[PDB]
């Protein structure tokens, strides 16, 4: 049972370095092939090269970037190391293995998400979104959560600590003049809320910042 | 280096019925016995899965619902009977030489029966307006097809700067999608101002669903 799982800073500065390890349990990397694949904003999917079993690399000559990949056999990792990096460095890298009996990229990471931009980061703002002021109700509410004003990328919600899954819609991030905006909509009985205490857990721990904000109901 | 060119983009697909997705290389990948072009498979959030291998070899695990087929320079994969979780982005890939090179992607949708939008307004919070802000919120929750119109109106007059306007991915379970919408202002422009409302225009009705609140009601 092979897993392999990324790691690395998530934020970096215009031409400075970048590097990147990939994990290896349950298979040893002096047997096999190992390789680092990324995808751009978009969906695009490119290949950057290998480390082979006896340490020989390859790296794709049709690269922008200036590329360095090593390992570590006492650890069972192996590393991707950019040079000089740009702002078109931004992408997701996964790791990847190429098995002599397979002949595939059939075992994945995770990945890892990586921005490159000089631009401070920023906390964000967590904003509460009670039902209109009126009394009116139907069979059930919904309710939400406003992230606003952050950077980078990203950032985690939850409801209640996880115990609230169902009924959840978490909208992907929006970019607009320089910070990120994303929200959350909860949806639950009418009985259920305000009697029993909703809350969006927010973090993001490129900014220090956890923040737990209870909906509260509207006073006139 | 080699190209390879996926066709289509974007291909929706009733549930039980099957999709077809193509895959054309600069250059042939085949080489005496063997092909070399492979399909992944990348749900949203995750990263890409291996499905065929060697152009028409079944990754263990892989539902048998999953096939490939070609050599040479075309290839294709078939998905039949096409289920809610395969809402996915497909790509081919070939190992014939180095460099290796991805397909652009295919994503599939599940054709969905068109289904309205839950619709939900959201007033400033005192906490934002303290800080000299006012964001206005639309929610749009569990609707089909996947384009949908939504306007603003400040005291029945359009407005369309300042608007972020964010969808999900496809719902893997019910193959629905839902959609924020925030119109962002000053604290003193919100408060010159009385009545604010969206309106969503989709094909699934005749007339735009209207949610509206005033200020100075309550």
């Known amino acids: 049972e092979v897993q392999l799982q990324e790691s690395g800073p998530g934020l970096a500065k215009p031409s400075q370095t970048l590097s990147l390890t990939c994990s290896v349990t349950?298979?040893?990397?002096?047997?096999?092939?190992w390789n680092w694949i990324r995808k751009f904003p978009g969906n695009k999917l490119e290949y950057m090269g290998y480390?082979?079993?006896?340490?020989?690399?390859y790296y794709n000559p049709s690269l922008k970037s200036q590329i360095s990949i090593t390992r570590d056999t006492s650890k069972n990792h192996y590393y991707l190391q950019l040079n000089s990096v740009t702002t078109e460095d931004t992408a997701t890298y996964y790791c990847?293995?190429?098995?002599?009996?397979?002949?595939?990229?059939?075992?994945w990471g995770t990945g890892t998400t990586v921005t490159v931009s000089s631009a401070k980061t920023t906390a964000p703002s967590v904003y509460p979104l009670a039902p209109v002021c009126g009394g009116t109700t139907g069979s059930s509410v919904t309710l939400g959560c406003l992230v606003k004003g952050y950077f980078p990328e990203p950032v985690t919600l939850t409801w209640n600590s996880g115990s609230l899954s169902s009924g959840v819609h978490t909208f992907p991030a929006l970019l607009q003049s320089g910070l990120y905006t994303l929200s959350s909509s909860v949806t639950v009985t009418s009985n259920t809320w305000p009697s029993q205490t909703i809350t969006c857990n927010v973090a993001h721990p490129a900014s220090s910042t956890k923040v737990d904000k209870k909906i509260e109901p509207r006073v006139p | 280096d080699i190209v390879l060119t996926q066709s289509p983009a974007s291909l929706p697909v009733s549930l039980g019925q099957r999709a077809t997705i193509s895959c054309r290389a600069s250059?042939?990948?085949?080489?005496?016995?063997?092909?070399?072009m492979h399909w992944y498979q990348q749900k949203p959030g995750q990263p890409p899965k291996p499905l065929i291998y060697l152009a028409s070899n079944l990754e263990s695990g892989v539902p048998a619902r999953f096939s490939g087929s070609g050599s040479g320079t075309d290839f294709t994969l078939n998905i039949h009977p096409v289920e809610e979780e395969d809402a996915a982005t497909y790509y081919c890939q070939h190992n014939r030489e180095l460099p290796y090179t991805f397909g652009g992607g295919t994503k599939l949708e599940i054709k969905r029966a068109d289904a309205a939008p839950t619709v939900s307004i959201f007033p400033p919070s005192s906490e934002q307006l303290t800080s000299g802000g006012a964001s206005v919120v639309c929610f749009l929750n569990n609707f089909y097809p996947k384009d949908i119109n939504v306007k603003w109106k400040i005291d029945g007059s359009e407005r369309q700067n300042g608007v972020l306007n964010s969808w999900t991915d496809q719902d893997s379970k019910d193959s629905t999608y839902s959609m924020s919408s925030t119109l962002t202002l000053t604290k003193d422009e919100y408060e010159r101002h009385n009545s604010y409302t969206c309106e969503a225009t989709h094909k699934t009705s005749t007339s735009p669903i209207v949610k509206s609140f005033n200020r100075n009601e309550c």
């Open positions: 990847a293995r190429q098995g002599l009996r397979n002949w595939y990229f059939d075992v």
């Open positions: 480390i082979s079993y006896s340490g020989s690399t």
């Open positions: 349950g298979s040893s990397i002096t047997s096999d092939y």
């Open positions: 250059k042939s990948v085949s080489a005496s016995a063997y092909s070399y």
